[PDB]
Structures are given as C-alpha cells and as structure tokens.
Design a protein around this ligand. Sequence first.
Ligand SMILES: CC(C)Cn1c(=O)n(C)c(=O)c2nc[nH]c21
Ligand SMILES: [Mg+2]
Ligand SMILES: [Zn+2]
Length: 338
Amino acid sequence: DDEYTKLLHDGIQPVAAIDSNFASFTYTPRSLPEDDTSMAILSMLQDMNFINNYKIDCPTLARFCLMVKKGYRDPPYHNWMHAFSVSHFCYLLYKNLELTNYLEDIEIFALFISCMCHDLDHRGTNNSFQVASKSVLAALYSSEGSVMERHHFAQAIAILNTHGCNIFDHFSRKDYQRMLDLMRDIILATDLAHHLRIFKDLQKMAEVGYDRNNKQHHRLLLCLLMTSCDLSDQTKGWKTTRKIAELIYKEFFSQGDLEKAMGNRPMEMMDREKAYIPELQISFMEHIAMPIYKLLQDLFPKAAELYERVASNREHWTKVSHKFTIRGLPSNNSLDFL
Ligand SMILES: CC(C)Cn1c(=O)n(C)c(=O)c2nc[nH]c21
Ligand SMILES: [Mg+2]
Ligand SMILES: [Zn+2]
C-alpha cells in the first residue's frame, strides 16, 4: 500500500529518465532494479499514449500494475522480471517498428497488457508436468490444452475482476469484449506448441505480404509479436544469453528432479544427468528462435539486428562448447568427482 501511494501521488517519471538507452534494442531491461519496474511500466504506458488515449484511471492503473507484479512467484526464470522484460520488448517494437501501420491501437494496447500478464502465477513447471502430476490446473484445463496459458489468462481476468483494478471498466461493452478476446488470443499464443502449429501460416503471410485489411493477418501478426517478446532475451548480448540459460535450466532441472521422484523419465532437456546445455541451446536457437526473428525481419526490415543477435548468440554457444569438456585436472587437482 505504500508502494501504491507513491506510484499514484508522485507523478509518472519521464520514460527517458529511466536510462539513455531505454528505447533501444540494445538495452537489457533486466538491468533495471526490480523496485523501479512498476513505475517503468507506467512510464511506457504513458509514452505509448495509452493512459490518455483510453482514459485509464490513475488509481486503478497503479493498483493493477502492483497486482500483476504481486501475481508472479519467484521460480528462477518465470518471475516478474521475465514479465517486465517481455513487456519492455513490446515497448521496443512499438518505438522502433511503426506497428501503427500494421495493427489497431487497441491491438497494440492488448499486446502490451498481455505481455505484463502472460505468465501470471507460473509455478516453474510446464504443461506436460501439470498433466503428469494431476495438478488442479490440469483438472481445470487439460481437456483444452495450453494448461498454464489458460491459467495465466484466467489469473489476468481475476485481477481485472478485483475491485479497484479493472483498468477497462469504463470501456463500451463491445470494446471491453474485444480487449478480453485479444488478451485470450495473445496469451494463449505464448504456448510454443501453438506457435509451431501456426508457423506455416506465418511463413505464408510473410511470403504473400501482410494485408492490413485481412483480420486473420492481424491475428497471426499479434501471435508472432507476442512470441518475439517472450523470447527476446535471446536478442541481447552474450552475457544476457548465458545468464538466461542458467535460469531456464535451473528451472527445467528442478522440474526433472520432481518428475524422477514420481517415477517418470524426464525429457533430456529436463534431466540434469543427461542435458548437454550447448547442444540444447543451439537446437532451441536454430529450430525456434532464429526462424521467429527471421520472419520478424521479413515483415519489418528494421528488425534485422534482432535476427543477427540471435544468430551471433547461437555461434557463441558453438565457440564455448569445448569448455564443457574437462581438460587436464579439475581446479582442485582432484579426480574425487569420479
Ligand atoms: C522458457 C522456455 C519455455 C522457452 N525457452 C526460452 O524462452 N529461452 C529463451 C531459451 O533459451 C530456451 N531454451 C529452451 N527453452 C527455452
Ligand atoms: Mg508462458
Ligand atoms: Zn514468458
């Protein structure tokens, strides 16, 4: 409540005061201290003109931002700093790519709020684990698929439906229904099985050319953009790539350990006794990340540097892999580890 009081009564800090490089593809939002991130979200919403444009109520918006923040747990990767960094990449796409030539204002606003909300209440395990472990979330949503994503979305809606937090409640019935439908489509798009299912449709869009009058093209493009935000850690420097891999694998291997403990054999990527990080990272980059940024470049020539960073981070894993083989003796001069 004291954070609220300051967020409401102090004023929204100019977005340029956050960092000289804040609106650049090269800025690493993970550099921002966590206690500074809710005010940075208000600064970005202001700079995108959404607060004025949609006449969002200030007290309601401050409550909503804090509630969203408080709705993340602290697994190594799927925490509020990941949501905050995804949301920042949305802001980057807006500042560096002329989205307004492709998407409706309301679409762009929904993509940004969906980025804030898209992993709410994640417990550091994936859809497969929900099913295998017979979790309450699979009881609710296993028949439809995308279990966690449905739960993120439901969590977002629960926040809006909390007294004092409905940032859309003055909207017309038509616009409110549109915003919530968009949030559903965008947050369900973050299931990488969904991205893989629509991949051919994305390629076909890129090849024939984006048609702004085509409602299906809008929908495909929001999916690609949301994916591109959710994987944007791979578009920074090598120090970020390396640190994100440490967090992702800590989280995956915790899951693998639970799976072992219930008698299931984990995916190789989830088993700490089998996973070979360089090879796993290179596969993720070649098979998932680079094709996404290449499609982004195809649609938006000014996105080319993102695809180039991902390709360079990929080359970097090949360059360091040799270090994963123990040459000589360990530092302690001991083979006790054997
Ligand atoms: C978090 C996970 C579902 C997807 N994912 C990811 O987003 N990044 C950035 C990776 O490097 C990665 N490696 C495997 N999965 C990965
Ligand atoms: Mg997710
Ligand atoms: Zn995410």
